[PDB]
Design a protein around this ligand. Structure first.
Ligand SMILES: [Mg+2]
Ligand SMILES: [Mg+2]
Ligand SMILES: [Mg+2]
Lengths: 123, 124, 132, 122
């Protein structure tokens, strides 16, 4: 599972869009977003670079870039978005809803939070 | 007069369905606003029903693409329409506003207050 | 002419019974994972026949999200047969369109009725009970 | 074997019964799965008719309550069992899926795919 700089900028764009939706400051959730993204196999500083790059692209362009991925790559993008909002393995109703919406628009497969966690472990 | 093609109106209702279904619950208030205010895009009840059916045959990613390429004035009214769906008595709750914000972000729509959305729709 | 002692009855439902009714209706219509705005409108319009004011409907609907489907079943299952018949009639008219119900809809209505202990009826008998 | 009590096995067959009767058609292939899989809860083949008959003594709503109160591990096996009954070659049609989901919702059972149910049982 390789990804271009453009594709990684899209993926982090989706994570950013999702976590900003509720307007709240949530330190642990941002830290999951940043730590787990490294499982794609960049370093922390590269995650920070890519996140700042994402400010310069349209979220709608990110949608398009993601939606054209093969199913294997989409499975792990969905798994990554799923683990972000997990707390002790649980997500609440409003979090599942957001994960569900961005998944639908991106054409991503449906999964449980347990599957998303198990997916990010094998990566 | 503001006009929208059939594929654009299909994309719009796809977005509305995706939004109101996101939490896996039916809130009849939201489905009633969804179908009534959709008429303000210049269509009859019979066309609304057709388009709801039409939307099942498109991918939500296709709908995103169709909306995101729209001019700013039209995106303004799509954002507004999505806003009034989730609103009640001029108020939006947190969970619902989070969903409206996210879908707006993904579709390239302008941010607005709920007051603004309600007033925009009164002008169509 | 002899008139006749008068007998009055009123069909009554507790708040949690009403919440249960609407939770059963939601569960039935979500089963196939699709939303039909027409079925939802009949659902809310005909719910009023249960004896509530329009402005109470929204909060009862909101109360339904805080209860388990399994608890709504327990609450319906223990009703007397007259009230069960009315609940079954209600569920039966939600998915009917022009007094007809397709086989899949009929199956869903049959299954929920079985689980809640409601009487079996045709969609015609459903539609009449609700009209009076 | 996932362990259930006698009164639980009674509730489970009552739910499988309710589900397969919903459309008015009692398909031998489905009854075969209903039979073969229930054996994996520690019931001999000849005994499935006995449990089915024992289920006449309880109402469907009482079966619902016996299932709704079970722990999440027991629930998983109940949902998986109900899911495989109407499946064919690993697939389930849209109508069958709608029936499985309604009964799962009413019994407070977890959502799963037909593939999960198959592998849970296997
Ligand atoms: Mg909803
Ligand atoms: Mg439906
Ligand atoms: Mg059958």
């Amino acid at each position: 599972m390789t990804f271009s700089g453009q594709e990684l900028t899209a993926i982090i764009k989706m994570a950013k869009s999702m976590v900003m939706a509720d307007g709240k400051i949530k330190p642990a959730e941002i830290a999951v977003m940043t730590r787990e993204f490294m499982r794609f196999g960049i370093l922390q500083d590269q995650v920070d670079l890519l996140l700042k790059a994402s400010d310069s692209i349209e979220a709608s362009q990110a949608v398009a870039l993601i939606a054209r991925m093969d199913e294997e790559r989409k499975k792990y993008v969905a798994s990554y978005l799923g683990v972000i909002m997990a707390s002790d393995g649980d997500i609440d109703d409003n979090e599942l809803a957001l994960w569900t919406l961005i998944s639908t628009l991106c054409g991503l497969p449906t999964m449980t939070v347990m599957e998303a966690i198990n997916n990010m472990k094998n990566l």
